[PDB]
Subunit: 239 residues, 3 copies
């Protein structure tokens, strides 16, 4: 069902959903490439316990790209320049116990734009949920190793100062990759990334890269100074 419509304000109010949903539809008149600083934060609140945080100030571009990788792609309409569907659980929907609800907030919005939220319910309830985490490589340092065991998808910020990537697999084999090779490998699973309103397609953003991780237990990044690199990693687990 329709959740909220935000316009004319920089910060969206705390939105509460008491109905068990399975996915969220984000629709806005801002094109996906034009999104700059919008952030989202979704979690599950319990009456007599600690909250369960699924996302925490995740960038809208990273959230959309992580949630729409595969056969699907973000679409458009005559009135909305961006429509995306992002699922919060595998197969079924989220099971809500007593005194349990869902809370969604939006931050860093543009004054003269529009945003909408829609909730998508399912005929089933499941215990598996999606979590989003962030890993940063600082600008001052040169190389860094980050452990991505248990994750199945990552989003890299694309920059020209990054030179080398290293993948360590489960069987201990280490493979060397370049940004060009990584982009070409990524575009062999989901060729088209988005469809524009006028009819043209875009096969990938110029500042984000979607890395599918299978049997990967580590990522080493070799770069130079002057820029900060960010990874948005997605995982599935039972709460």
């Amino acid at each position: 069902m329709k959740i909220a419509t935000i316009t004319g304000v920089t910060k969206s109010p705390e939105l509460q959903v008491t109905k068990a949903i399975g996915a969220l539809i984000l629709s806005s008149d801002v094109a996906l490439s034009a999104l700059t600083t919008e952030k989202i934060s979704i979690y599950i609140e319990r009456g007599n316990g600690s909250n369960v945080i699924l996302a925490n100030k995740v960038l809208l571009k990273d959230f959309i790209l992580a949630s729409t990788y595969g056969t699907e792609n973000t679409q458009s309409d005559a009135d909305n320049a961006m429509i995306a569907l992002c699922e919060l659980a595998d197969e079924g929907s989220i099971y809500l116990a007593d005194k349990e609800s869902i809370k969604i907030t939006l931050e860093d919005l543009i004054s003269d734009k529009r945003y909408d939220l829609h909730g998508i319910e399912e005929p089933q309830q499941t215990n598996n949920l999606f979590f989003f985490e962030q890993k940063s490589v600082a600008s001052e340092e040169f190389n860094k190793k980050i452990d991505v065991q248990g994750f199945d998808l990552a989003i890299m910020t694309v920059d020209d100062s990054v030179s080398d990537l290293s993948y360590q697999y489960s069987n201990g084999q280490v493979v060397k990759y370049l940004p060009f090779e990584l982009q070409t490998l990524s575009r062999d699973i989901d060729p088209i990334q988005a469809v524009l309103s006028d009819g043209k397609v875009v096969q990938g953003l110029t500042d984000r890269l979607t890395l599918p991780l299978v049997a990967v237990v580590g990522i080493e990044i070799n770069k130079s100074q002057g820029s900060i690199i960010n990874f948005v990693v997605r995982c599935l687990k039972t709460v």
Copy 2:
């Protein structure tokens, strides 16, 4: 083989095919979005028993859309502005006895256009066939229940007077959607509906909506008064 080429008239001659075909190819110089009133009628004239009716004046837009849902789409050559492949059977082709035939006819054409029919033969024979049925919702009706048990695909005429549509599943849950929610959810299965000659792609017609029915046993329509809603449903069965 080439069945017919029709131009200059408003009604097709009663065409007959004796060879066992499994699929039809409809080609025309009229774009997919420019089809208005053309209709098709297909039926197999059996010799031992009753005849088989596969399509009874089905509108050409819905006939094309109900067959090209999934990995495929309707294409366009440099000469023909619309080419579509529509299957009449499952896997193999239609099994025909010594003197049986398949009779096809077209109605409500345009005198300054051209329509071309092709038939595809297949190595195997089968008895399973696809049936296209038509359902209607009256102008004075408020809410209506339709049993879609056994079907797997429907096409509805998109109208502004339709408020809600509710899916009833096999296990007994009822989920109420919206037109926008249904469009978004259906666009994630076949993100591309057609490809134009100039290279632009179209992700969906603005006046038809395709609904895939998986484990769905009921459809409830809630709308206002003053319009007739049209559904074209496809089913697979053995005759």
Copy 3:
């Protein structure tokens, strides 16, 4: 890794690859429709006797079209006008026994265009390899039968003289197709052959057609005199 950057010459030198690779990346500033006479030759050199010939002076267009059939398609970029990923083995990379290495070369290049090779490494090794063969039908004859058993993919040249293409399957059934029917049927599996730089798509090349051979043991060509018809077939086998 980086293999070669050929520019300013009409013939690339012999290139040796010592470590195991499983896929090549061909990149250039000429689009898929701008490749005319470029040829590629890949083989495996054994130190003490005999070589394994995978591809010998195969046209670059046919090599690219025989590898990117299916979900994938040839990519573009803001700098590279064509990128194509062609796998040289199934699943893993090519296993190398004692004292052998891969060797690649190019012929018939345009002296004012840029070509680039990249290699892809994998964490697995395999024995299966992809072999490419070429078949021809002369210009002074009318009909001819060719035997394609064991090949899973073929590429034929498209000419106006081709009238009928008869298939012969493993169960003995014979089906006669037309060029239009073949073109329509081949686009039901891969509807998009390439994605252009500006955001448009192309569903196929004008002079080349791709035929997937499943349960097919023979082909017959009925054509008029005037043009030589060329086939490039791909097979998978162990070495």
